Amino acid sequence: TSGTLSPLDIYPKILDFHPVTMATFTMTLARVCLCPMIIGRGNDQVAISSKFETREDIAVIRNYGNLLLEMSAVVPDGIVAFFTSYQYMESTVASWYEQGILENIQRNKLLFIETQDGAETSVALEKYQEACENGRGAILLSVARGKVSEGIDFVHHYGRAVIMFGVPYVYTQSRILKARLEYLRDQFQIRENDFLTFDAMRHAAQCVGRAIRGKTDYGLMVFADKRFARGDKRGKLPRWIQEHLTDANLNLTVDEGVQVAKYFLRQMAQ
Amino acid sequence: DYIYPEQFSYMRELKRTLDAKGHGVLEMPSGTGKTVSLLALIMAYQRAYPLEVTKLIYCSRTVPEIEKVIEELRKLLNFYEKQEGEKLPFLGLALSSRKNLCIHPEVTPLRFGKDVDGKCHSLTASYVRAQYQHDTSL
Amino acid sequence: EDELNLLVIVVDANPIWWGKQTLSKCIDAVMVLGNSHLFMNRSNKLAVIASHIQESRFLYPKYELLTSANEVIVEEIKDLMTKSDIKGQHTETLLAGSLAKALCYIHRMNKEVKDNQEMKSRILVIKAAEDSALQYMNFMNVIFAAQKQNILIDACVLDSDSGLLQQACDITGGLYLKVPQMPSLLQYLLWVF
C-alpha cells in the first residue's frame, strides 16, 4: 500500500507478479481538495520553453519567480514551495543570502538547505506553526526529495498550500542505471514513463500527501511546468479516481490564484 | 467493545484478499486512518489458525514514523490482556539498527575497519570472557 | 397571513390616567388600532389584559370578533375604575401578573397551534406607572421567560418611569418608546411598532 494507488499497473510491473487487488477504505468528496497547474495567462507569456530550464534565466525570472510572488503575496497563508533541486531554489528566491545580486524574489521566506540538523529542523516547524507566512511547511523553500517530506504529526492543520516550482523530475546516470533503462526497454518498451516520470510524480505526491494528510482535513497543491499535461494522464498524481459518486477532482480555470482564494472561503464556510 | 463501520463494510472482502496466501495490494487514505485501520482489519484474523497462529511485521522508512505506528497501536490494544484490553491481547515492539540504538559501542573501538556486526561480536566476546573469568578487567 | 400572529396588549390601568385626564380616549384609540391589526390579516389575533394596581385581569380572552371585543373592553374597564388604588395611592401596577397571564395564554394558544404550524406572538405594554424594588424579581422572572420564548415585549410609556419595562424591551429585543405627546397615542401604536 501507498495511500492512493488506483491506476494499479506499476506495482504488478515492478513485481512481475499479480497480487489480489482491493480498495479498503471509504473516501470523502473531491471538493475538500483542489490540485492546480500554472503556465501563463496571455499570449506574450513565452518564457517557459524549458529546453534548458537549468540555464533559462528569463524563464526563472518570469512566471517561475514572479507567479510564486504573486500567489504567495495574494494567498497570504502558510505555504511551502517545493523545488526540483537546491540550485533552482537558490536562483528563484534572492532571500537574505543570494547566489547572485541578479535574482527575482523579494519577500520574507525561510530556507531548508543541506546540513539540516534534527534540532534545527524543528525550530523552523515551530516558527511555521506559530504564526506568520514563514517556517518549515510555511513560506519556505525546500527541495521535494529532502527531509521536509517526513512532515510533522501536529493536530493543527499547519499546512495550507504547496506550490511545486517545477514538477519533481529525476535523471538516469550513464552507468548501472543506464544498464537498467536498457533492460526495461527490452522487456516493456514504454519504459520512460514507468521507470522515471511516474516514480518522480509519486515523489511529488508524498510531499503534497503529507500536507493534506487524509479524509479528515482539506488542502491544495499546484504544479508549475510546461510539460504538465503528460503528468495528468495515466493517473500518476493524486487527482485520479477513488469512487465514481464523488463528482470529479477538476482544476481547469482562467485564473488559479482567484480560484484557490474562492476555495478557501468555501472551506471556511463548510 | 466495537470497531468502525468502515471495518465492518470491508472485512469479509479483506479476509478474502488475504486468503490467496502469498500476495495482495490494498488502497487506503493519504495517511490519516491507514495504519490503524490495518490493525483493526488484522483483528479479524488475530488467531485464524489456532494450531500455528501467524504473526504481523511492519516495514518503516524512519524512526519518528515508528513512534506514530506504536502510539496508534498502543491506543488500539490499550493492554496485552482482557484485564485492561478489548481488541487484541497482542504484544508489540519497536526496533532499529544497533548503529542507532547504541552510542557507547560506536565510540570506544574507534578504527576505520570496525563494522557494526563486528562490534556485537566484540561485545559478545568480552561478555563470555568476563563470564569465563575476566569480569575484574575485560 | 401564513403565520398566525397573536398580539397581546397589556394596558396599565393605574390611576395615573387621572394625570392623563383621557382614559376614555385611550380606549377608543386602542380599539381603532386593534381593528386595524385584525383587519390586516385573517390569522391575526388579539388578547387584551389590564394591569391594575391590585391585580392583573383579562379584558378579552379574530377580527370578526371585533364587535364583541369592543363591548367586552368598555365594560371590563369600567368595572376596574373602583376607588381602591386611587390616584397615586398606589404608584405601581401589577405588570408581573399581567405578563404571567399573557405568557400563559400565548402558551396555550401555541400548544393548540403546535398541532398545526408555528405561531408568532408579541406583547405590547401601555405603561403609565412606576417600577418598584419589590417588583424586580417577579417582573424579571416574566421578562426572562419571554426572552427565552423569544417573545418580544414592546412598551409605550405614556408617562412615568418604568425602568424595568425599558430593560424588558432591551433583553427581549423589543421596542421601547417614551412618548412625547401622549395624545399622539394612536400614531405611536400604529407607527412605532
Add this chain to the structure above:
Amino acid sequence: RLGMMRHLYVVVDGSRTMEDQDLKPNRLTCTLKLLEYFVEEYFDQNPISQIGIIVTKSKRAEKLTELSGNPRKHITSLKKAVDMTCHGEPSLYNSLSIAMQTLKHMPGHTSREVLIIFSSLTTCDPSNIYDLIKTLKAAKIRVSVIGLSAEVRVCTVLARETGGTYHVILDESHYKELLTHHVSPPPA
C-alpha cells in the same frame, strides 16, 4: 436582560491588510460600520455594562475610547476612526496589557472580556505572549477572536486558553451574525 454587569474591551486590527476590498471597499469600512451596529445592540441587551476601545496599527496600540457605560462615546469613536484608516502591522501584546490593566481593577461578579477583529497573521511585539496568556486565564480575562479568512496558531490558542471563542468570518452577513452572538450575556 438584567442579572450582572459586563466589562468588554473591543480591539480592532488597523494594519495595512484591513484596507483590502475583499469585504466592503476596505474591510476597515465594513467592520467599523457593523461594530457601531453591535455597540448599540449589546448596550440595549446589556443596560448595566461597560466597553473600552483599542486599535492595533503602524506596529502600536492606541485608545480610541476609554472604559465607560455610555454607548454614544463608542459609536462616535467608530465614526471618527474611519477617516484615519489603517496602515502597518498589529501590536496585540501591548493591547492585551492595557486591556488587562483596566480589567484587573473590576470587581468579583462582573465579566472581564476582550473582543478582537483580526485580519493579520502574526504581531510585531517582542514580549513573550505565552506568559501574558497564562496571566489572562489567572486574572479571568476572556479573549475572543473574529478572524478574516485566517487560522494562525498563536491567536487561536490565545482565544481557546482564555475561554474558547476563535471564529472565522467570510462575509458582511457572517460578521453581523458573529457580533450578534457576542451581544448575548453570560450566566449568573
